[PDB]
Design a protein around this ligand. Structure first.
Ligand code: SF4
Ligand code: SF4
Ligand code: FCO
Ligand code: FCO
Ligand code: SF3
Ligand code: SF3
Ligand code: F3S
Ligand code: F3S
Ligand SMILES: [Cl-]
Ligand SMILES: [Cl-]
Ligand SMILES: [Li+]
Ligand SMILES: [Mg+2]
Ligand SMILES: [Mg+2]
Ligand code: NI
Ligand code: NI
Lengths: 581, 263, 581, 263
């Protein structure tokens, strides 16, 4: 065994080893290992991405106009965000500016994805870590109605409703076919809701499973389908015609009416169902405001997103702010430049890749994706792993750093950056939320805080959907219909050699695509994705990433039941296909 | 009792699993609660780690010969199969063990059916579709990237209601939804037959809904239900929202030239 | 002034004359006049249909295969019922038998219409006679939640929901643009609900206005569109393909899945919203069990409907019973024959039509539709009717009689026929309903009873939708897909001369179409429609029809505000376009 | 304040009023509560008789020159107009009074636009469309029997949002929804082009969704949005459910021969 110090942690791999493989209620493809001491406290944590596909290799030699469709298939959960980053990257390289309506529609596509992805995460992925589903069978339906009505104006709250949901669950389990609930952690001492709150949350899990299908109708109108909508370099393909012959062949007033109807319904569900449930989880689980801090009180990163001035990616345009904090100094929000070779770099000394010098980091314009499966001296063998060796290479995930620092990305990171830049709406929302829980601001830097910030952001994004829709309609009233720029669509119009960066804030954090074009073809295409940051393995200094840091120092009630590990990992919304691409 | 279903995931992006939960009729909630018993699924299940491994073993043992195996994604043959690792072993070993006890296999999506994006040139991981590994079980191919939500749920309801597999074409695709081409039920066909084409994005032709053939539409060579059943409760499909078909239901569609080159 | 005796009534046209023109919250096109005595009690009532189009004339010379499409446009409220009667009549004339799936689908079309038409009548047409909308502004939202939860399991019952509905109504009213609520009867002493019940009812009015649009999606799947779906002579045009190439072009498993989802939602709404609201109207308005009896304790008529054995219109096949009662003798339910010239006859001595002898009645195979506008002295002119002259011709509606008797048709009529034929389900349901209201069986023969019977028919029809869907699916599992017979589609296969009758129970009552075919074309086409019976003018013996009888003997609290007249007329669901055709 | 609307009814079957309440987006509830002030409508209003006459008189007087008049159905010229009687007098008098104060008129449906079924041979009442009687006001024709629900609500929202009437063709129909033929956006056009036709009901061709031209479809001569926007929240349209177009949006469609004779 060894022991060393990094980032205020003591990393010690003596003592009992626990393995969690598979991690479930994520997209898939993660392994986690920890060591625990005699006091059932985590003293070492190991994050491993267990798949790889190689999109950066597949993109070589492709037409730049096609790239968005290939990289969209990095992920069907965060569907669309890689297409957006791609068209941004290719437009930056070639020198294309899109019409205002194309930028507005792209912002609608991104806000739609934030609402859908955040809502499904809260209920279908994270919810069963906090709600004891089998304990819902013990609730009194009238007391459940009274609880729900004390928290929200949402209409669906009758005693008869909660009894009907409870009886559906009772029937489901009475044949002994428990399905997704089989062999769960039910009755664990960390389940703290009363039976009435379990029944309320389970009813809401079912309501959200049904409602989420409606949100993505916005993607179907502008992008054809969800999952995996369509886009173009130069704007969007969804031509608009409101008052001319042939409007039946285009985005017309009836299509816009459908979009408006979905926006209103989406805002209502998020504000009256998800927001009060997130606050209720907080009220009943306040100790989790001090568990899972990790890097969130040290180093956080946002690129920024939602340019409101078309083709302007600067500070005055981006509606979701960008910036970086290091060394715990939230009084110094630093500017980020994605072209600077000293800022974003990726290391592979602890990952399954080859570099000419694995002791140094490479900026993505100098990036290399040369896969090399070499797990070294594992317990077991190379095709039957019992324990990864975290002193050597242990993941398909590269290790990104910012100026050499390990960073956390995602909803909590963005909330902290916006709060400390002085964004008025963020400051008001956070202050009101923490006041309601009677918790200090530092309570947001935690596993519970990640969940609260995600709910905050779903509400924010639902409000921005209306804002962008109104902006689109204002242009149409003024006779401004354009959706595509095509003066640089043909390859003969491009520079012989050029490079560009496309960046945004995906639901899980800071996303960048770096592209180089030569002689009409993709010469290099490198992606650094939010879960690549958070699920990162170690670097040559032994610095740990956001998941490994957030698991450090966690108490476990029952070592064989990983509920506390699941709570903290799920709070980041891991997307492992994204992380490895 | 409801029919046991085991759903496993190889190299994949999760799009077919997401498509399934978009179903409008029956709701995915009602499929899980009332039509089938979804007994294993890494994306939805409560149990993780050793508890999830115990579920997998218990279900494939107690219901040996009686469960349906749903597969999203595909196995990589490179690096001894360790481009996709499950419980510390090659994913292919979990696929073979799950397949051996199944009564039948549903290959959801172009990944499981043919290869999809990871198998496009140069295929770094040597990703291989399910029917090149499993050669002794019935496999129904349901291709698309992903397949249409209400096609997925209609196939499931057919199998439960009628207690049999759907009739298939010579490639193993259900005749009901894959028997005809996109271009044989496309609402822009009048424009194709008249020579009325979009020539550049957002031109006057585009604003009247003219045909997308000159913009690269692959509808003429693609079999699926997108131009009739449509997507997301019938709201739209790629062509209706102004982009040509990519050909995403067909084997090898990524390597047939640019999406913007004519068919 | 004069007076005479008929059917137990004293018809007396002395005293003050009141005119109600237009009657609103019907399809349109009705005038009502009454005389009241010195105690403000109605001693004379006059029913007048104020429009005519002449479909029976327009149908002459048409191809019999086209007839359904023309006569469907008799009415867009009871949309489809005239098409069904037409295809039945042409098939009866030519000698065509349809496949079992076509019959099942036609029964689904009719049950869907019953559900839709009865639901929209209860809320949008009759509701504001019983609910004081402006009084809802005085309700306590918590007490409204409590009331709703005591009556039903329906989920939508939170105090915040009822507050939100109430605030929306307050903002609507506050600017003085009261729309459909302007110059209403609000505050009339016959409004007996407490403020909480008025708010609950208004919330449900709005829920029903939204939900009704979904029910007709069943008509869109099998019939292309609603209003006015498509049909064929020989079956239905909606070919079925479940498991063969090209199912994308036909009724397939996805289309059937959509139909099933609509059936379940429709039953849930009717059973948990409409049914408890109807029973509550009964509880708070018991005196209306003794008002508006009219002919319902004297003479009632049903032809029967919903043949469960394909092409068999006999008593063992029809799921909704047929029969007639006369002279108050409910112990002898009599059989009806639509070919017998001594049974159904229409008179025009008090209507705007010419017969060679207006003192005799004509069976529809001998019918004549020769319009003659001749109002006599109306205290104004031919283009200014100040007072109809009920001693002579006063309506565009003909006067149908059954064996010379004036009859009531519709939900109450049907319920009484089925009850007295000893249908076990009907006996049990009626007995339990009247028991819960603590009223005698005779309480059903009233204005309140008409409303209770309509709601219990909506429930019955929603149950039969599932029964018919399951029968369709059973045939498909057994490989029986046929939807059309075409052996006799071509006119060269028809008899040179033939005649037939098509009959059903529309939402408002007994419907018949009589057709004669000669040399491949329609020679005669005569319709007798449910509101033709109910809204009938007088005959040569002075006998009064169902509306005039039900208004007789009624007390009015405020003569100038006709709320009691509206309550009783709306209880029949008048369709004046149907009545005149 | 919301724009005042007066809705009157001549000879009609009520199908256009019923179509309006079928709207999916915006819901008819939200049109009435938030977008317009529906100040007179015989099918929905609380007031009857003298109280309804008072509403009519007060609205057209207070808002003279500023309300929109919606018309469903038509006036008959036979029997001195007494084939359609309102408040004891010919409907035509109410029509002329209401038209005189309106800023613009919406003629809903084939009845108000052209004549529809009551005007089909031999037209016993001499039913006559609105534009032959009212000759000094803007009239927007929205034909169909009835028009599509979501077309009706889209036209309303266009007028409220943009504060202008829609641009129209030479017959007064909105270009947005009536600029193209049914057959120019029909998903069965591939079959028409190939000579692939239904020949008798429920034949093998009908079960594969072949073209309905030989069954009498009037799509090739009819202008409407049914084959693109579709009916009842996009669920179907006449052709998709197996019956040819009747031609119901076109002037004189009842008297162009049998619905089952070819164009
Ligand atoms: S848009 Fe594509 S599928 Fe449609 S007609 Fe044109 S080429 Fe064929
Ligand atoms: S079904 Fe009618 S509209 Fe469609 S292609 Fe055939 S003829 Fe044209
Ligand atoms: N959100 C998201 Fe997916 C990840 N990580 C991307 O980009
Ligand atoms: N119901 C109905 Fe209409 C009437 N009366 C018909 O038939
Ligand atoms: Fe649904 S996993 Fe998504 S990539 Fe194309 S089918 Fe594969
Ligand atoms: Fe909507 S009233 Fe119905 S008949 Fe043809 S449009 Fe007329
Ligand atoms: S790209 Fe795919 S989704 Fe349908 S329209 Fe073409 S098969
Ligand atoms: S009949 Fe009418 S509804 Fe449309 S498809 Fe033809 S114009
Ligand atoms: Cl492929
Ligand atoms: Cl016409
Ligand atoms: Li740019
Ligand atoms: Mg990368
Ligand atoms: Mg008649
Ligand atoms: Ni992702
Ligand atoms: Ni009617």
């Amino acid at each position: 065994s060894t022991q060393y110090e990094t980032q205020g942690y003591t990393i010690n791999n003596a003592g009992r080893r626990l393995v969690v493989d598979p991690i479930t209620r994520i997209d898939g493809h993660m392994r986690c290992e920890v060591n625990i001491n005699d006091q059932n406290v985590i003293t070492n944590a190991v994050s491993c991405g267990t798949m790889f596909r190689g999109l950066e290799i597949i993109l070589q030699g492709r037409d730049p106009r096609d790239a968005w469709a290939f990289v969209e298939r990095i992920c069907g959960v965060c569907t669309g965000v890689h297409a957006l980053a791609s068209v941004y990257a290719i437009e930056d390289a070639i020198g294309i500016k899109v019409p205002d309506n194309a930028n507005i529609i792209r912002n609608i596509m991104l806000a739609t994805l934030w609402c859908h992805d955040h809502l499904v995460h809260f209920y279908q992925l994270a919810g069963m870590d906090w709600i004891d589903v089998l304990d819902a069978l013990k609730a009194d339906p009238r007391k459940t109605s009274e609880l729900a009505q004390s928290l929200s104006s949402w209409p669906k709250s009758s005693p008869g409703y909660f009894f009907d949901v409870q009886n559906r669950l009772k029937k489901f389990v009475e044949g002994g076919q428990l399905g997704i609930f089989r062999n769960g952690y039910w009755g664990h001492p960390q389940y703290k809701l009363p039976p009435e709150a379990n029944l309320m949350g389970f009813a809401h899990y079912l309501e959200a499973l049904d409602f989420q299908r409606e949100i993505v109708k916005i993607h179907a109108v502008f992008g054809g389908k969800n999952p995996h909508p369509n886009w173009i370099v130069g704007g969007m393909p969804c031509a608009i015609n409101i008052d001319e012959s042939g409007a039946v062949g285009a985005v017309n007033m009836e299509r816009l009416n459908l979009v408006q109807s979905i926006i209103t319904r989406t805002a209502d569900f998020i504000n009256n169902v998800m927001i009060p449930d997130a606050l209720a989880i907080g009220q009943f689980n306040k100790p989790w405001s001090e568990i899972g801090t990790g890097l969130s009180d040290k180093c956080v990163l946002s690129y920024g997103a939602f340019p409101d001035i078309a083709n302007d990616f600067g500070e005055k345009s981006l509606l979701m702010p960008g910036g970086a904090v290091i060394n715990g100094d939230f009084n110094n929000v630093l500017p980020v430049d994605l072209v600077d070779p000293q800022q974003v770099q990726e290391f592979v000394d602890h990952a399954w890749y080859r570099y000419p010098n694995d002791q140094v980091g490479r900026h993505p314009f100098d990036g290399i994706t040369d896969p090399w499966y070499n797990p070294g001296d594992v317990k077991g063998s190379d095709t039957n792993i019992q324990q990864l060796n975290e002193q050597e290479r242990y993941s398909w995930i590269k290790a990104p750093r910012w100026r050499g620092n390990a960073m956390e990305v995602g909803p909590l990171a963005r909330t902290l950056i916006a709060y400390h830049k002085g964004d008025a709406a963020t400051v008001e929302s956070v202050d009101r939320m923490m006041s309601a829980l009677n918790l200090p601001l530092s309570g947001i830097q935690s596993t519970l805080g990640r969940i609260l910030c995600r709910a905050h952001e779903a509400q924010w994004a639902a409000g921005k959907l209306q804002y962008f829709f109104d902006k689109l309609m204002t242009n149409l009233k003024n006779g401004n219909l354009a959706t595509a720029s095509t003066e640089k669509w043909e390859p003969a119009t491009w520079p012989t050699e050029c490079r560009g960066v496309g960046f945004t804030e995906a639901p899980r954090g800071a996303l960048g695509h770096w592209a180089a074009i030569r002689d009409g073809k993709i010469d290099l295409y490198q992606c650094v994705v939010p879960t690549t940051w958070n699920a990162s393995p170690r670097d040559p200094k032994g610095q740990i990433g956001a998941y490994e840091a957030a698991l450090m120092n966690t108490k476990m009630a029952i070592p064989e039941q990983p509920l506390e590990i699941l709570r903290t990992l799920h709070s980041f919304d891991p997307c492992l296909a994204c992380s490895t691409h | 009792p409801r029919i046991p279903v085991v759903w496993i995931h190889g190299l994949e992006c999760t799009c077919c699993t997401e498509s399934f939960i978009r179903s409008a009729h029956p709701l995915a909630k009602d499929v899980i609660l009332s039509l089938i018993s979804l007994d294993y699924d890494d994306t939805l299940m409560a149990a993780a780690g050793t508890q999830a491994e115990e579920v997998f073993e218990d279900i494939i043992t107690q219901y040996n010969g009686k469960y349906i195996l749903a597969v999203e994604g595909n196995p990589p043959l490179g690096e001894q199969g360790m481009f996709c690792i499950s419980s510390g072993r090659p994913f292919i070993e979990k696929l073979k063990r799950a397949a051996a006890g199944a009564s039948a296999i549903i290959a959801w999506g172009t990944c499981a059916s043919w290869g999809c994006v990871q198998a496009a040139r140069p295929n770094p991981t040597q990703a291989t579709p399910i029917d090149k590994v499993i050669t002794d079980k019935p496999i129904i191919k349901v291709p698309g990237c992903p397949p249409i939500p209400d096609v997925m749920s209609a196939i499931i309801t057919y199998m439960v209601t009628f207690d049999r597999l759907p009739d298939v074409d010579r490639m193993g695709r259900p005749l009901m939804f894959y028997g005809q081409r996109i271009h044989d039920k496309c609402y822009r066909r009048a424009h194709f037959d008249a020579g009325e084409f979009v020539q550049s994005w957002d031109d006057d032709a585009a604003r009247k809904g003219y045909c997308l053939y000159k913009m690269g539409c692959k509808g003429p060579t693609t079999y699926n239900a997108c131009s009739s059943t449509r997507w997301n409760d019938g709201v739209s499909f790629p062509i209706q929202s102004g982009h040509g078909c990519l050909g995403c239901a067909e084997n090898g569609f990524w390597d047939r030239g640019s999406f913007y080159s004519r068919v």
